Design an enzyme around this catalytic site. Sequence first.
Site, short mmCIF file in Angstrom:
data_model
loop_
_atom_site.label_atom_id
_atom_site.label_comp_id
_atom_site.label_asym_id
_atom_site.label_seq_id
_atom_site.Cartn_x
_atom_site.Cartn_y
_atom_site.Cartn_z
CB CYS B 238 9.70 38.92 2.61
SG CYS B 238 10.70 37.33 2.36
NE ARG B 243 8.25 32.61 0.88
CZ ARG B 243 8.33 31.29 1.11
NH1 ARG B 243 8.88 30.81 2.22
NH2 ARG B 243 7.83 30.44 0.21
#
Lengths: 286, 288
Positions: B238, B243
Amino acid sequence: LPADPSPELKQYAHPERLVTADWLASNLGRPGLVIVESDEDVLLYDTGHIPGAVKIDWHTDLNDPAVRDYINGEQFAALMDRKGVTRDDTVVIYGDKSNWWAAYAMWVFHLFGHPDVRLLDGGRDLWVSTGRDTTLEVPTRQTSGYPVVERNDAPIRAFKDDVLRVLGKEPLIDVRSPQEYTGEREEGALRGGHIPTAVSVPWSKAAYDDGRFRARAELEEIYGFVKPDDKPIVYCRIGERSSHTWFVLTYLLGHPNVRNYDGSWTEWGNAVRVPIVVGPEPGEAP
Amino acid sequence: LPADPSPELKQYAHPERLVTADWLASNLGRPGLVIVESDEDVLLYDTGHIPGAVKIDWHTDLNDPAVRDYINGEQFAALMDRKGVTRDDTVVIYGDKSNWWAAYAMWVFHLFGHPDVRLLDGGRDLWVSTGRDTTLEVPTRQTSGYPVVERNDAPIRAFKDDVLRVLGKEPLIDVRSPQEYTGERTPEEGALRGGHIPTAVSVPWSKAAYDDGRFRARAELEEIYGFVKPDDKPIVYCRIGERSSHTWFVLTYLLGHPNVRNYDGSWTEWGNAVRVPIVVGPEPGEAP
């Protein structure tokens, strides 16, 4: 086109790489001379510029659109043609912010070996503050046949692995503000601090409040720690302020073998598992 | 402490790595169980949390203070002691946003081999929206003696050079929004270039969750992730590794794929590096 013979420039190691404002005023419109404005602010040229000057924008004209790198030789030739610059012309570059982006553009020209490039001492700031003539008029001149050259990075550019190999063996010079250097403070980074061993000499120390380069004697003392056998590397956030310091060390002080680490803190402060020193002291090699 | 026997979990490949809200409420305050809240917003806990829960703060607790890397074994052991977690305890983790930061905390515990870690299906969102009990009281329990272990990166973590070696040989999954994937959108997390890693495919992370916070049914997840084959060795990424941990959990434990790795460097490393290959636009593109 000979060198500017003004007496005030003779104090420097290679005086021919600079010109004064009064020299430029008496040479405007002469054949074999092209004038280039290069600014941080892409909108500034359209508010007024030196008569006959063309515009170069570092972001749109000098960078590859897809990868983090400069343009190639084939693309540099096409840009010269569109701007009316031949291989034989004297190019004088100037701009806002004490010539930060004018020095960066000069550094890029050197990658392609353009024979005669010079800076206007004081840049756009001084030209305007002294009340000299400006115009909104944009030149139409175009030329053809600038040669296709292979880009030559090695002599003036350092990559991340070049830096790691010399930690502790050569001077490394961080030219950002003091608060950036210690780590207290689009261009953000996940970590703050400096590269291990780096010394703090902010780009500022080399210029007067009016934008002109400082006298030789003042320069000899700020950068006197650099010994004659040294091969120094300069860096900042993306490589524009380090361009200004490259010009100073190379042409005003006459020091060979200076390289600009363009990756700078935007690369280093974002890479996983690379060594970093926090605080006001330089630190040791790994 | 046995696995949650609820029939709604049997559809998944490894159901013991999840608990339901009913199971948790039934077991609150039991010996051998520690509850941990983990959120992107570090102030959220102090506005209310599950009774008996302790807080982990991703910035101060899990990162080295100077270099871009996680903490070591010695520092992990000291943190477990301060929080009152022993090696033999069952640890249940939960947070906001369908468990976004809860899965990242779980990924870090796996680097240090903690034996029994589980996530609460639905997280903080489902607990609150269904009107269950919360409190401001902070537990004062502390322990001593957590063992010092050598951190074990290789099975679950990929570095920049690992990614370059497999371009066009293994599936690469970009979990950002579609606009970031194309390079239309580029903030301590900004980048000097936009686009994606060459050959990568787009699967935004929130496709794996319902709007109430729970993980989707197995059938829906197999439609989205069915392109991943039994013999594949996938890498997820990401903007930062925190994340893309959610997708690592889904692939590994809900669908049963071994050998998935998280490229924590992610776009903040790759989009700021000098002279690396990048593909702009809506198509995956070719290996170099």
